[PDB]
Chain A
């Protein structure tokens, strides 16, 4: 394949792929390039047959222009946006906590017509954040991703509902714009047509018709075939066009009687003006396609018109009338049916570019309002464009979007796959969309149009199910925002390698066959009938003559993550979802290793993630070091790549890169020259291959629990580096400026032994919870010590320190090595917040080993907590003495419908120990379908089994039966995949053979270090006197309602009382109970909880006389 550095991973695939997997990050980079109008996008648009393409920002500036003051005495026009070089490098932006942005410049032509003058000069429009290569935004040091938003597209949507009141099928239609007010029509059960403008009270359609100027004759002529409109006209009292305006106007202005001019112009302004109503260039297209109007030209108009509104009304009437095909004067014939709002032919995708463009438009609208207000009150013929253009609102809008918008999310740097799948995520929620607690089931259920566009397997398992998804592997975003997918064209029973990208609504006009349907060597279909999708989403058999399109490859419907799972067929969708989701939670291990049995995706997903380093130009490696790689290109140019070492990710996982090249080695352009965290030789490596035996073992693996060999702890098989950041800032107060110093009041000399002269913890020192990280003190002020303290301080005579200790200390339950310090000082002219003087950040790194309670998981949705780690000698071992690394329970496999893990286990053993099919008298029948490359392979040979073109069930048996002998010359595993294990504790062999193989297991990031809590006594909240928890040290557990029900059901009174009063809210009783425990005395009775007293006070404050009496 094109990738030069691919390790030789033999593949079981049998189908030739006609299309190469596209750039997985294109959905972000292409959209952003469109936004800024880069020359690459401009040239590509021309190559697509377009003429005079306009960038996203050029579109906004042209829409803003021309700014015209009323009476037309002057005008202003922005144009020609330009970008200069970025202010700082990405690495420097991250290090110094800046925003990666480039200056933006435009030209502004100001025209004075009353004198004919024209002026123009470059105007600085501010710093514009820039998408870095590999698709992320650096905002205030943090790394952020803008997730594309799936939203229902503007257009006309007809719907029909049957009502049991009369069993009639009532009809309604809604016209939804991208900007402006709404409009809808409906047919009532009384055989009448109604209109609702801006969701106001229902009114007859004839009112709207006569408002536009229609009369009896025109309505009779065009709509006379329908009884409902005739009845509505007969019932309506309106007579004359002005009469309709008389009725309409007072509804919005109850107190002002109408005037003809304003009333007549109100309708045009409300809907038929592009100033206040806009279809946004996509609603226009959809309306033209649906109603058949204005087809065949790129209509610049985006406002509502008279012809289209009446066309929509007529379409509704005909749909109620019962027509199946309709035609329009001056238009084209179209079918008649209701519209499904869940179809991707109706739902579009706001990419990052459009999301940024909307906020740019809002900011420029505010700027326009300010400019048009202030241009009336300045000297004419002496004003200058740069002296009245105010760029503050646009910069403020841009800052707000990247900071507070729900879409601009923190980059998910758990591992390369997590970041890769986060960039191409689709979100149905957020502003302008739906919400988590609404939309019911309909919005989130799967739909036949998702095939090849949105993955049905991968999705959050929590309450966001269906509301969040992943773009398909082959899918690309249409310029209008729709999702396109590629298909092969087939002519009269023979395929043809011309691939067309079809949108969702165009696919329904054809029948598409499966990718795996066999074909002759010439491309002709070999079968008489083929299984195909139909226009309604059904799957049916069809004669080979009738097919007109074909799937590109079997992997078309799955996402990047789902494509990683081998033997995806044998895992139920419920568990496939879990398997796809867990891979995003795997932590990077110290040394990653690629899986023995995997999928062809493992390579590309690693390279496209952007975490690895690839050679930009062909050349020879000149110098290699742990920190940088220098390469001499064949053209005479020299490149230097810096490798980030032990950098802390967003979630605390280490992100170390390492070189994989030797000095003097020649590298082709695009070749991988350094691995990322979870990669080996360019292939992704999220976990570890290890020996698994499937059998219950003394109940330690009971209920999904897992047993590990102690070897994994001795040899750092599952060890991972974790890095934490502790930050402390010194500010000023009314009593003076608090300072950072080594010496602090009343601390033992040993405690401050590892502190620098400036009070910071010495780099490389070992730190344990409670140790000093930064010595800090604050002015104390008035003390007025108690008499006992006065006497004590007289006894020793120690000074009453003018300052109080507020030093930063290691949190409870943390430890590690101090690997770095970053310090900001205002005396050096830093960008510290207002009122801040100093800032110190200390990085503490630790080396976590696998231990009890750590969650492990596989690629097939099987996970569990490590219940016991046994010594090596206690593990069952093969007859040759090799102990099994992990033991999994048998009862969990068959009932969870994830048998694919057993297939993976068998194929892993086949891969570890080479195989050689005995081709002595011809290939065996079961091996007749295998490629010649798979006949033999050495030990430790990696294999690839694509998700829908992998090894069959029959070939696995043969491969198991043809495994090579072990080191000593004997086979450890029989053809059935089982071995005679020996019991490590009693020594006796197990009575029956046990399934043994090699499985790829992942170390999930769900460490309970942030979920283990303990509290005897701690902080209490200011407002409610109950303990706080879940966001600070020593959090308290919530004793819920159902627990109170359980307490009452037990008949347990005293325990419940002490839980609700002493332990939680009785302010007086807490200290009494604490002193009783300390002194060894029995606990006193509880008091009245503060909640009840506050309730009485609150009721009394509301003029309610509430009292307790006996």
Chain B
């Protein structure tokens, strides 16, 4: 009777891993000693600090 939508829209594209965006992973460590990984694109400019999980 009435209609609405989420805060976004859908995309019908299909392609898969055959296209690769060059990426590398940075490593971070927090105060309590936990460590985490974050994949960034090869454009890099990786930040010195990151908000982890």
Binding site for B on A (CB under 8 A): 786, 1019, 1022, 1031-1032
Contact = CB atoms under 8 A, between A and B. Distances in A.
B13 interface: yes
B1 interface: yes
Question: 4 smallest A-B Cβ distances: which pairs?
Answer: A1031-B1, A1022-B4, A1032-B1, A786-B13
Nearest to B9: A782
Interface string B2-45: 01111000001100000000000000000000000000000000
8 contacts: A786-B12, A786-B13, A1019-B3, A1022-B4, A1022-B5, A1022-B6, A1031-B1, A1032-B1
Contacts of A1019: 3
A1019 B5 CA distance: 12
Nearest to A787: B13
B48 to A, nearest CB: 34
Nearest to B5: A1022
A1031 B12 CA distance: 29
Contacts of A1022: 4-6
A379 to B, nearest CB: 51
A1032 B3 CA distance: 11
Contacts of B1: 1031-1032
B11 to A, nearest CB: 8
Nearest to B6: A1022
Nearest to A1019: B3
Contacts of B12: 786
Contacts of B3: 1019
A1031 B2 CA distance: 10
A812 to B, nearest CB: 16
B8 to A, nearest CB: 12
Contacts of A1032: 1
A646 B3 CA distance: 34
Nearest to B13: A786
A436 B5 CA distance: 36
Contacts of A786: 12-13
A1032 B4 CA distance: 15
Contacts of B4: 1022
Nearest to B4: A1022
A786 B6 CA distance: 21
A1078 to B, nearest CB: 15
Contacts of B5: 1022
Nearest to B1: A1031
A1019 B3 CA distance: 10
A1083 to B, nearest CB: 20
A1022 B3 CA distance: 9
A967 B1 CA distance: 60
A1022 B4 CA distance: 8
A1019 B4 CA distance: 12
Contacts of B13: 786
A1022 B13 CA distance: 22
A1063 to B, nearest CB: 21
Nearest to A1022: B4
A483 to B, nearest CB: 41
B39 to A, nearest CB: 25
A786 B12 CA distance: 9
A1019 B1 CA distance: 11
Given A1019-B3, A1022-B4, A1031-B1, 5 more contacts: A786-B12, A786-B13, A1022-B5, A1022-B6, A1032-B1
Nearest to B11: A786
Nearest to A782: B9
A961 B13 CA distance: 85
A783 to B, nearest CB: 11
A786 B9 CA distance: 14
